Amino acid sequence: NGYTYEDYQDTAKWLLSHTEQRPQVAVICGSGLGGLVNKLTQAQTFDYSEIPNFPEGHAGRLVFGILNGRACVMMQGRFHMYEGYPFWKVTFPVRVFRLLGVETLVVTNAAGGLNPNFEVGDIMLIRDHINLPGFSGENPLRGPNEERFGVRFPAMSDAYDRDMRQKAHSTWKQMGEQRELQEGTYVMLGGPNFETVAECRLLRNLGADAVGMSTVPEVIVARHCGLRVFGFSLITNKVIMDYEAGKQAAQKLEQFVSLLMASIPV
Template sequence: MTGYKVANGNGHSNGNGNTKGTNGTNGHSNGHKSADYTAQENPTYPYEVIEEIADFITKGSGMRPKIGIICGSGLGSLADMIQDPKIFEYEKIPNFPVSTVEGHAGRLVVGTLEGATVMAMQGRFHFYEGYPLAKCSMPVRVMKLCGVEYLFATNAAGGINPRFAVGDIMLMHDHVNMLGFAGNSPLQGPNDPRFGPRFPALVNSYNKDLINKAIEIAKAMGIESNIHVGVYSCLGGPNYETIAELKALRMMGVDAVGMSTVHEVITARHCDMKVFAFSLITNKCATEYSDKKDDEANHDEVMAVAKNRQKACCELVSRLIREIHLASA
């Protein structure tokens, strides 16, 4: 199917003053005609559109990847590990959104890692960029139709749990979907059973075997004291949280907070992928009032910490992928 667009005000600027699309177009000049969808009428992408994007990637790369990776802010180096990479700029993929956030390059990288076939998003889509959640997580469905069975979702996050230090890694074992509390979901709109059920269950969303394997790997790497297992929550952003919000999240049992990942995990579980996710703690969140400037999160710090810790994150991911690959060989 050609001629599809999601017309809901994603004519955003990329931060350099270049507007990548106007009047709700996705800014592609690939000759695709516009169809008559709006976010209000139908925020989802038809199956055939996802299929067309997946075909573009599998034919263009000559691969059907088994593992999908989403690189968090400043964690794009996860995709740089991929061997014999075939690179697809988001702007050149039909009907794909574009990345607008610093630290999110906007490329899909397909190749092999530790013997496994993988595809990695070097740049994810966030709700605060102006994309509806279904659009933010649409690439997860593309991954599914490319053949992906495992989703590795990574993010940079603020540590709310007082035991967490900057640079620690929190393996996600659950989440609190704050956007869901507000009535928003990537699964809103008509359900296509070819992806999954109308009412998916989300208990056990985070694969326990993969968490346990990651803990073993962290021990072998000698970083077990920097590894935690905890609960992540996604807020809409782009502002960081107030002290009162952080206090409330802590009372709800949240250990780390960010602005992503949850809708990707929901979409992945809906279509029955196995999920592994972690947060790199890039800043400590204050849960008490003070005059300290240090308490204010900022994206430069987030990126700097991610850069400093990319080696450990890369090793954790590549060793876990190796285990998956060896177990299935």
């Protein structure tokens, strides 16, 4: 990592100096879900280019506001390794949120469906992940440990909060959806090219249910600094294993995350 603890502190202090908003929840909005910021009350926007130390698709804006009675901060757009970012830059905002007093991180993305029972328009609660770049040492925690954030060797087996996963299923039932809420394992790869058929079949055989190019590094850094995490993949395509509806599902995920603010503790 190239940021010091004080760089994260400088940024969080700057934000605290520019808004009265004191969010307890942070939401990182992935592809096609930038529309969720429109649901916010008492909204305040900062372009990423205006926030000291922020890394330079979606808007590139941070929006504070009230969602279903809950103070939250949202990333409308995220940072991607395939854009040339190292993970220590991709995940900069996660530590900033911890230093604002955020306790819960919600992550969303759009993903390719590997599980043969998934359909375009499915929402997958993320139950677990597989971190392929992490296998090779590309990791946002690589470098000397900052103990002011967390431990040298953090556990990742409980990353996706089990109580929030229960709330998620209960809430979905309340919504009266005809399609079941999917859940499963997300695998991250670098991108930016889409996968070959041979790569897809390999990934499915590893136990992955969905494939994307983001999110995992944010979850690792969140868990390291003690945030509660839950998240969702929008299944916007079903992958080909042999040699649109995303819009309505995105709107559905927006209502869903909105309802779920009620179920986040404290």
